[PDB]
Amino acid sequence: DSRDYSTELSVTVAVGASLLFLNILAFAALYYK
Amino acid sequence: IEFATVNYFTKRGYAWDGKSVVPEK
Amino acid sequence: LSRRMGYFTIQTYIPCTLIVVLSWVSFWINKDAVPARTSLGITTVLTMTTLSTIARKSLPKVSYVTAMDLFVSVCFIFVFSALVEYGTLHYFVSN
Amino acid sequence: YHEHYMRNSRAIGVLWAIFTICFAIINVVVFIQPYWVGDSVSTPKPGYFGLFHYCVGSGLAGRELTCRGSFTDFSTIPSSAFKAAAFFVLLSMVLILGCITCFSLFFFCNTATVYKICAWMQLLAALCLVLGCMIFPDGWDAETIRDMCGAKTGKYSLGDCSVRWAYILAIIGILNALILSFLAFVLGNRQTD
Ligand SMILES: CCCCCCCC/C=C\CCCCCCCC(=O)O[C@H](COC(=O)CCCCCCCCCCCCCCC)COP(=O)(O)OC[C@@H](O)CO
Ligand SMILES: CC(C)CCC[C@@H](C)[C@H]1CC[C@H]2[C@@H]3CC=C4C[C@@H](O)CC[C@]4(C)[C@H]3CC[C@]12C
Ligand SMILES: CCCCCCCCCCCCCCCC(=O)O
Ligand SMILES: CCCCCCCCCCCCCCCC(=O)O
Ligand SMILES: CCCCCCCCCC
Ligand SMILES: [Cl-]
């Protein structure tokens, strides 16, 4: 087994950034009067 | 659970008194 | 070896869940039916206490919680909370 | 304009609930899955460990990952720091599940009150998650963690091992929790219009 963790961390950071960016879109819809 | 459902729809807290006639609907 | 769960599903989990549902039934009983709701809550607690005795029959006297013990304990907390909830409701509605 | 504002507020509330459920899923997954730290090529033994659980290899050119640890039995947890971190993460999970339960209160209670209740409870869950993530490294000086990772490890000293997906997902959960708390606060203060 290749004992490296980059693709795993890559997908984890990707989904995390996706959820975070969705929440920033929620802020964008919110603060916009 | 059936008794719970029955009790949910019971309006009056007093039972029939015997003497009084019930006007059937 | 892996344990089978027909025994524990039929005799422990389903009864505990149903006793918890019967504890919930007290909320739908009309307020001011104090004997009915009090009897329902306390006798559900008694039934849960009776059910919690057979959980440890198979096991030795291990000094840690198991999954079954956790489930039974949470169900006991739920029925206890229901009874205490009705007690608080009755006290604050009477005065 | 009023109907547009109402539709936007309703949609943002629904999406906030969806993201709250997603963060609860994240919190449960990081609490359960034992992939907070992981071995490396320089690690003498292979294995990993979470908040409380830990698997280690025997070291005979095979996996044979003996797994020990359980939050339900605090004796098996390697260190007091691990116990405290696991307790804090559990408390955060309980808080977010409590808000998911309190979603039902939108039927009866005023929307501002429920929004602010989950705002505060998500804030507390975020602080508990921060405390857990800050306290968890303190236990790296435990004898078994040192044995697995190596002698270079210590308090706030990763050494040879590497952080795996669960720890970074927990950090993402902290950020998402703080964000959801702020979003709930602003939603509660905005629905009055
Ligand atoms: C696997 C995970 C499973 C987790 C699921 C757990 C389930 C959790 C329990 C219940 C959820 C449903 C609750 C629905 C409640 C929504 C009810 C609602 O819409 O209320 C209205 C406000 O709308 C509003 O802007 C409030 C909007 C925010 C609502 C937030 C909850 C949405 C949940 C929708 C589910 C999405 C799908 C998720 C599935 C994965 C006004 O009300 P109302 O004038 O009459 O009086 C209120 C007072 O102010 C005066 O009496
Ligand atoms: C009352 C509502 C709002 C919240 C309920 C919180 C529940 C879901 C929490 C409280 C205690 C938790 C348990 C605590 C310990 C363990 C042992 C671990 O090895 C697996 C998860 C497990 C079994 C947890 C599952 C989730 C749990 C049962
Ligand atoms: C925990 C579950 C307990 C079950 C309690 C059963 C009582 C159900 C009462 C609701 C009946 C349906 C009411 C319909 C509304 C109406 O009055 O028109
Ligand atoms: C120790 C717990 C016993 C169970 C108590 C159940 C019902 C408690 C009701 C609320 C008590 C607190 C109200 C105090 C009011 C006062 O000052 O007299
Ligand atoms: C796919 C893994 C699902 C983990 C459970 C999620 C629990 C959500 C609690 C509302
Ligand atoms: Cl466990």
Coordinates of C-alpha atoms and ligand atoms in Angstrom, one line a residue:
Chain A
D1 CA 0.0 0.0 0.0
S2 CA 1.2 3.5 -0.9
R3 CA 1.5 5.1 2.5
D4 CA 0.8 8.6 1.3
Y5 CA -2.2 10.8 2.0
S6 CA -2.6 13.6 -0.7
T7 CA -5.5 12.5 -2.8
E8 CA -7.5 11.9 0.4
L9 CA -6.5 15.3 1.8
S10 CA -7.1 16.8 -1.6
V11 CA -10.8 15.6 -1.8
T12 CA -11.3 16.5 1.9
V13 CA -10.1 20.1 1.3
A14 CA -12.1 20.2 -1.9
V15 CA -15.4 19.3 -0.3
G16 CA -14.6 21.5 2.7
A17 CA -13.9 24.5 0.4
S18 CA -17.1 23.7 -1.5
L19 CA -19.2 23.8 1.7
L20 CA -17.4 26.9 2.9
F21 CA -18.0 28.7 -0.4
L22 CA -21.7 27.8 -0.3
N23 CA -21.9 29.4 3.1
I24 CA -20.2 32.5 1.8
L25 CA -22.8 32.6 -1.0
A26 CA -25.4 32.4 1.8
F27 CA -23.7 35.5 3.3
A28 CA -23.8 37.2 -0.1
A29 CA -27.5 36.6 -0.4
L30 CA -28.0 37.8 3.2
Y31 CA -26.0 41.0 3.6
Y32 CA -27.1 42.2 0.2
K33 CA -30.0 44.6 1.1
Chain B
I1 CA -52.2 4.1 21.3
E2 CA -55.8 3.6 20.2
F3 CA -57.0 4.8 23.6
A4 CA -54.7 7.9 23.2
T5 CA -56.3 8.6 19.8
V6 CA -59.8 8.2 21.3
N7 CA -59.0 10.5 24.2
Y8 CA -57.6 13.2 21.9
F9 CA -61.1 13.6 20.4
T10 CA -63.1 13.6 23.7
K11 CA -64.7 16.9 24.2
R12 CA -66.5 16.8 27.5
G13 CA -64.7 15.7 30.7
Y14 CA -67.9 14.4 32.3
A15 CA -69.5 11.1 31.5
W16 CA -73.2 10.3 31.0
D17 CA -75.3 10.6 34.1
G18 CA -77.9 8.0 33.3
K19 CA -81.0 10.0 34.0
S20 CA -80.4 12.5 31.2
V21 CA -81.7 11.4 27.8
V22 CA -79.2 11.6 24.9
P23 CA -80.5 13.4 21.8
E24 CA -79.1 11.2 19.1
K25 CA -77.5 12.9 16.1
Chain C
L1 CA -17.0 -15.0 15.8
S2 CA -19.8 -12.4 15.4
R3 CA -22.9 -12.1 17.5
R4 CA -26.5 -12.6 16.3
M5 CA -29.1 -9.9 17.2
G6 CA -32.5 -11.5 16.9
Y7 CA -32.7 -12.0 20.6
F8 CA -31.6 -8.5 21.5
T9 CA -33.7 -6.9 18.8
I10 CA -36.9 -8.6 19.8
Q11 CA -36.5 -8.7 23.6
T12 CA -34.6 -5.5 24.4
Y13 CA -34.5 -2.8 21.7
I14 CA -38.1 -3.0 20.4
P15 CA -39.7 -3.1 23.9
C16 CA -37.5 -0.1 25.1
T17 CA -38.5 1.9 22.0
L18 CA -42.2 1.1 22.5
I19 CA -42.1 2.0 26.2
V20 CA -40.5 5.3 25.2
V21 CA -43.3 5.9 22.7
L22 CA -45.8 5.1 25.5
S23 CA -44.0 7.7 27.6
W24 CA -44.5 10.2 24.8
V25 CA -48.3 9.3 24.8
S26 CA -48.6 11.2 28.1
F27 CA -48.1 14.5 26.2
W28 CA -51.2 13.9 24.2
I29 CA -53.4 13.2 27.2
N30 CA -55.3 16.2 28.2
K31 CA -53.9 18.4 30.9
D32 CA -55.7 18.3 34.3
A33 CA -56.0 14.5 33.9
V34 CA -53.4 14.3 36.6
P35 CA -53.9 10.7 37.8
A36 CA -53.8 9.3 34.3
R37 CA -50.7 11.1 33.2
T38 CA -48.9 10.6 36.5
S39 CA -49.7 6.9 36.5
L40 CA -48.7 6.6 32.8
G41 CA -45.3 8.2 33.4
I42 CA -44.4 6.4 36.6
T43 CA -45.5 3.0 35.4
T44 CA -43.6 3.5 32.2
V45 CA -40.6 4.2 34.4
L46 CA -41.3 1.0 36.3
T47 CA -41.6 -0.9 33.0
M48 CA -38.3 0.5 31.8
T49 CA -36.7 -0.4 35.1
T50 CA -38.0 -4.0 34.7
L51 CA -36.7 -4.1 31.1
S52 CA -33.2 -2.8 32.1
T53 CA -32.6 -5.8 34.4
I54 CA -32.3 -8.4 31.6
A55 CA -29.7 -6.4 29.6
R56 CA -26.7 -7.7 31.6
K57 CA -27.8 -11.4 32.0
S58 CA -25.6 -12.6 29.2
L59 CA -22.6 -10.4 30.1
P60 CA -20.2 -10.7 33.0
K61 CA -20.0 -7.8 35.5
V62 CA -17.8 -5.6 33.3
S63 CA -17.3 -2.1 34.7
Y64 CA -17.8 -0.2 31.4
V65 CA -20.9 0.7 29.5
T66 CA -21.9 -1.3 26.4
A67 CA -24.0 -0.3 23.4
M68 CA -27.1 -2.1 24.9
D69 CA -26.5 -0.4 28.3
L70 CA -26.2 3.0 26.6
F71 CA -29.5 2.4 24.7
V72 CA -31.4 1.3 27.8
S73 CA -29.9 4.2 29.8
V74 CA -30.9 6.8 27.1
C75 CA -34.5 5.3 27.0
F76 CA -34.6 5.6 30.8
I77 CA -33.5 9.2 30.5
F78 CA -36.3 9.8 28.0
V79 CA -39.1 8.4 30.1
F80 CA -37.7 10.1 33.2
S81 CA -37.6 13.4 31.3
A82 CA -41.2 12.9 30.1
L83 CA -42.4 12.4 33.7
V84 CA -40.4 15.4 35.0
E85 CA -41.7 17.5 32.1
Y86 CA -45.3 16.7 33.1
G87 CA -44.5 17.5 36.7
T88 CA -43.1 20.9 35.8
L89 CA -46.1 21.6 33.5
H90 CA -48.6 20.7 36.2
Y91 CA -46.8 22.8 38.9
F92 CA -46.5 25.9 36.7
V93 CA -50.1 25.6 35.4
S94 CA -51.6 25.1 38.8
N95 CA -50.2 28.4 40.1
Chain D
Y1 CA -40.3 43.8 -2.9
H2 CA -41.8 42.3 0.2
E3 CA -42.5 38.9 -1.5
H4 CA -38.9 38.8 -2.8
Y5 CA -37.5 39.4 0.7
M6 CA -39.8 36.8 2.2
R7 CA -38.8 34.2 -0.5
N8 CA -35.1 35.0 0.0
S9 CA -35.4 34.7 3.8
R10 CA -37.3 31.4 3.5
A11 CA -34.8 29.9 1.0
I12 CA -31.8 31.1 3.1
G13 CA -33.4 29.5 6.2
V14 CA -33.9 26.2 4.4
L15 CA -30.4 26.2 3.0
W16 CA -29.0 27.1 6.5
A17 CA -30.9 24.1 7.9
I18 CA -29.4 21.9 5.1
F19 CA -25.9 23.1 5.9
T20 CA -26.6 22.6 9.7
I21 CA -27.5 19.0 8.9
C22 CA -24.3 18.7 6.8
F23 CA -22.2 20.1 9.7
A24 CA -23.9 17.6 12.1
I25 CA -22.9 14.8 9.7
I26 CA -19.4 16.2 9.7
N27 CA -19.3 16.3 13.5
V28 CA -20.5 12.7 13.8
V29 CA -18.0 11.5 11.2
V30 CA -15.0 13.1 12.8
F31 CA -16.1 12.0 16.3
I32 CA -16.4 8.4 15.1
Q33 CA -13.8 7.8 12.4
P34 CA -10.3 7.2 13.8
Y35 CA -8.2 9.1 11.2
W36 CA -7.0 12.2 13.0
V37 CA -3.3 11.3 12.7
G38 CA -1.6 8.8 10.5
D39 CA 1.7 7.0 10.1
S40 CA 4.4 8.1 7.6
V41 CA 7.3 6.4 5.7
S42 CA 9.6 7.3 8.6
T43 CA 7.2 5.9 11.2
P44 CA 8.6 2.8 13.0
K45 CA 5.2 1.2 13.2
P46 CA 2.0 1.6 11.0
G47 CA -1.3 2.8 12.4
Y48 CA -3.5 5.7 13.2
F49 CA -5.6 7.2 16.0
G50 CA -8.6 9.4 16.5
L51 CA -9.9 11.2 19.5
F52 CA -10.1 8.0 21.6
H53 CA -9.6 5.0 19.3
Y54 CA -6.2 3.9 18.1
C55 CA -5.0 1.1 15.8
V56 CA -1.3 0.1 15.7
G57 CA 0.5 -2.5 13.6
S58 CA 2.4 -5.4 15.0
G59 CA 5.4 -4.8 12.7
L60 CA 6.0 -8.1 10.7
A61 CA 5.6 -6.8 7.1
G62 CA 1.8 -7.2 7.5
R63 CA -1.1 -5.1 8.5
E64 CA -2.3 -7.0 11.6
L65 CA -3.6 -3.7 12.9
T66 CA -4.5 -4.4 16.5
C67 CA -7.2 -1.8 17.4
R68 CA -7.9 -0.6 21.0
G69 CA -9.7 2.3 22.5
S70 CA -13.3 3.4 23.1
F71 CA -15.0 6.5 24.4
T72 CA -17.5 4.3 26.2
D73 CA -14.6 3.0 28.4
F74 CA -12.4 5.9 29.5
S75 CA -9.7 3.6 30.7
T76 CA -8.7 2.6 27.2
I77 CA -8.1 6.2 26.1
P78 CA -4.3 6.8 26.0
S79 CA -4.2 10.1 27.9
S80 CA -6.3 12.7 29.8
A81 CA -5.9 15.2 26.9
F82 CA -7.5 12.6 24.6
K83 CA -10.3 12.1 27.1
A84 CA -10.9 15.8 27.3
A85 CA -10.8 16.3 23.6
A86 CA -13.2 13.4 23.0
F87 CA -15.6 14.8 25.6
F88 CA -15.6 18.3 24.0
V89 CA -16.2 16.9 20.5
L90 CA -19.1 14.8 22.0
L91 CA -20.5 17.9 23.6
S92 CA -20.3 19.8 20.3
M93 CA -22.1 16.9 18.6
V94 CA -24.8 16.9 21.3
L95 CA -25.3 20.7 20.8
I96 CA -25.7 20.5 17.1
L97 CA -28.1 17.6 17.4
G98 CA -30.0 19.7 19.9
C99 CA -30.3 22.5 17.4
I100 CA -31.5 20.0 14.8
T101 CA -34.1 19.0 17.3
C102 CA -35.0 22.7 17.9
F103 CA -35.7 23.1 14.2
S104 CA -39.2 21.7 15.3
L105 CA -39.7 24.9 17.4
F106 CA -40.2 27.0 14.2
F107 CA -43.8 25.6 14.2
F108 CA -44.8 27.3 17.6
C109 CA -42.1 29.7 18.8
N110 CA -41.2 33.0 17.1
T111 CA -38.7 32.6 14.3
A112 CA -36.3 35.1 15.7
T113 CA -36.1 33.2 19.0
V114 CA -35.5 29.8 17.4
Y115 CA -32.9 31.3 15.0
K116 CA -31.0 32.9 17.9
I117 CA -31.3 29.8 20.0
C118 CA -29.5 27.7 17.2
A119 CA -27.2 30.7 16.7
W120 CA -26.0 30.5 20.3
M121 CA -26.0 26.7 20.3
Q122 CA -24.0 26.4 17.1
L123 CA -21.6 29.0 18.5
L124 CA -21.1 26.8 21.6
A125 CA -20.6 23.8 19.5
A126 CA -18.0 25.6 17.5
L127 CA -16.2 26.7 20.7
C128 CA -16.4 23.1 22.0
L129 CA -14.9 21.8 18.8
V130 CA -12.1 24.4 19.0
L131 CA -11.4 23.3 22.6
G132 CA -11.3 19.7 21.5
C133 CA -9.0 20.4 18.6
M134 CA -6.7 22.5 20.8
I135 CA -6.6 19.9 23.6
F136 CA -6.2 16.8 21.4
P137 CA -2.5 17.4 20.6
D138 CA -1.5 17.6 24.3
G139 CA -1.9 13.8 24.5
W140 CA 0.7 13.1 21.8
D141 CA 3.3 12.7 24.5
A142 CA 1.4 9.5 25.7
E143 CA 3.6 6.4 25.8
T144 CA 1.6 4.5 23.2
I145 CA 1.4 7.5 20.8
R146 CA 5.1 8.0 21.2
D147 CA 5.7 4.3 20.6
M148 CA 3.7 4.3 17.4
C149 CA 4.8 7.6 15.9
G150 CA 8.3 7.7 17.4
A151 CA 10.4 9.4 20.1
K152 CA 10.4 12.8 18.2
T153 CA 6.7 13.3 19.0
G154 CA 5.4 15.3 22.0
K155 CA 3.0 17.9 23.2
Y156 CA 2.2 20.0 20.1
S157 CA 4.9 18.1 18.3
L158 CA 3.7 16.0 15.4
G159 CA 7.1 14.5 14.6
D160 CA 7.1 11.6 12.1
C161 CA 3.3 11.0 11.8
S162 CA 1.0 13.0 9.6
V163 CA -2.4 14.6 10.1
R164 CA -5.1 12.7 8.2
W165 CA -8.5 13.7 6.8
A166 CA -10.4 13.7 10.0
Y167 CA -8.4 16.5 11.7
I168 CA -8.7 18.8 8.7
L169 CA -12.4 17.9 8.4
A170 CA -12.7 18.9 12.0
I171 CA -11.1 22.3 11.3
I172 CA -13.5 22.7 8.4
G173 CA -16.3 21.9 10.8
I174 CA -15.1 24.6 13.2
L175 CA -15.2 27.1 10.4
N176 CA -18.6 26.0 9.2
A177 CA -20.0 26.0 12.7
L178 CA -18.9 29.6 13.4
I179 CA -20.3 30.6 10.0
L180 CA -23.6 28.9 10.6
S181 CA -23.8 30.6 14.0
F182 CA -23.3 34.1 12.5
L183 CA -25.7 33.2 9.7
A184 CA -28.4 32.2 12.2
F185 CA -27.8 35.4 14.2
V186 CA -28.2 37.6 11.2
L187 CA -31.3 35.6 10.0
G188 CA -32.9 36.1 13.4
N189 CA -32.2 39.8 13.4
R190 CA -33.3 40.2 9.8
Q191 CA -36.7 38.4 9.7
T192 CA -38.1 41.3 11.7
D193 CA -37.2 43.5 8.7
Ligands
LIG1 C1 -30.9 12.6 7.8 C2 -31.1 13.9 8.6 C3 -32.5 14.1 9.1 C4 -32.6 15.4 10.0 C5 -34.0 16.0 10.0 C6 -34.5 16.3 11.4 C7 -35.9 16.8 11.4 C8 -36.0 18.0 12.3 C9 -37.5 18.2 12.6 C10 -38.3 18.9 11.9 C11 -37.9 19.6 10.6 C12 -39.1 20.3 9.9 C13 -39.4 21.6 10.7 C14 -40.3 22.5 9.7 C15 -40.6 23.9 10.5 C16 -40.9 25.0 9.5 C17 -42.3 25.6 9.8 C18 -42.4 27.0 9.2 O1 -42.0 27.2 8.1 O2 -42.8 28.1 10.0 C19 -43.0 29.3 9.4 C20 -41.7 30.1 9.2 O3 -41.0 29.6 8.1 C21 -39.6 30.0 8.2 O4 -39.2 31.0 7.7 C22 -38.6 29.0 8.9 C23 -37.6 28.5 7.9 C24 -36.5 27.6 8.6 C25 -36.9 26.2 8.7 C26 -35.7 25.3 9.0 C27 -36.0 23.8 9.1 C28 -36.2 23.3 7.6 C29 -36.1 21.7 7.6 C30 -36.6 21.2 6.3 C31 -36.0 19.8 5.9 C32 -35.1 19.9 4.7 C33 -34.6 18.6 4.1 C34 -33.5 17.9 5.0 C35 -33.5 16.4 4.8 C36 -32.1 15.9 4.7 C37 -44.0 30.2 10.2 O5 -44.7 29.3 11.1 P1 -46.1 29.8 11.8 O6 -46.5 31.2 11.2 O7 -47.2 28.8 11.6 O8 -45.9 30.1 13.4 C38 -44.6 30.3 14.0 C39 -44.6 31.4 15.0 O9 -43.8 32.5 14.5 C40 -46.0 31.9 15.2 O10 -46.9 30.9 15.5
LIG2 C1 -30.9 14.6 22.9 C2 -30.4 14.8 21.5 C3 -30.6 16.2 21.0 C4 -28.9 14.4 21.4 C5 -28.6 13.0 21.6 C6 -27.1 12.7 21.5 C7 -26.7 11.2 21.1 C8 -27.0 11.0 19.6 C9 -25.3 10.9 21.6 C10 -25.1 11.0 23.1 C11 -24.0 10.0 23.5 C12 -23.5 9.5 22.2 C13 -22.6 8.2 22.2 C14 -21.4 8.4 23.1 C15 -20.4 7.3 22.8 C16 -20.3 6.5 21.8 C17 -19.2 5.5 21.7 C18 -18.6 5.5 20.3 O1 -17.6 4.4 20.2 C19 -19.6 5.4 19.2 C20 -20.6 6.5 19.3 C21 -21.3 6.6 20.6 C22 -22.2 5.3 20.7 C23 -22.2 7.9 20.7 C24 -23.3 8.0 19.7 C25 -24.2 9.2 19.8 C26 -24.7 9.5 21.2 C27 -25.7 8.4 21.6
LIG3 C1 -45.9 9.6 20.4 C2 -47.1 9.3 19.5 C3 -48.3 9.3 20.4 C4 -49.6 9.1 19.5 C5 -50.7 10.0 20.0 C6 -52.0 9.8 19.2 C7 -52.9 11.0 19.3 C8 -53.0 11.6 17.9 C9 -53.9 12.8 17.9 C10 -53.9 13.6 16.6 C11 -55.1 13.0 15.7 C12 -55.1 13.8 14.4 C13 -55.6 15.2 14.6 C14 -56.1 15.8 13.2 C15 -56.3 17.3 13.3 C16 -57.8 17.6 13.5 O1 -58.3 17.7 14.6 O2 -58.5 17.8 12.5
LIG4 C1 -34.8 17.7 42.4 C2 -35.8 17.6 41.2 C3 -37.2 17.2 41.7 C4 -38.2 17.2 40.6 C5 -38.8 18.6 40.4 C6 -39.8 18.5 39.3 C7 -40.7 19.8 39.2 C8 -39.9 21.1 39.5 C9 -40.7 22.3 39.2 C10 -39.8 23.6 39.1 C11 -39.1 23.8 40.5 C12 -38.4 25.2 40.5 C13 -39.5 26.3 40.7 C14 -39.2 27.0 42.0 C15 -40.2 28.1 42.3 C16 -40.1 28.6 43.7 O1 -39.3 29.5 43.9 O2 -40.8 28.1 44.6
LIG5 C1 -22.7 8.4 5.6 C2 -22.4 8.6 7.1 C3 -23.6 9.1 7.8 C4 -23.3 9.5 9.2 C5 -24.5 9.8 10.1 C6 -25.0 11.2 9.9 C7 -25.8 11.6 11.1 C8 -26.6 12.9 10.9 C9 -27.3 13.3 12.2 C10 -28.5 14.2 11.8
CL6 CL -16.7 2.0 21.4

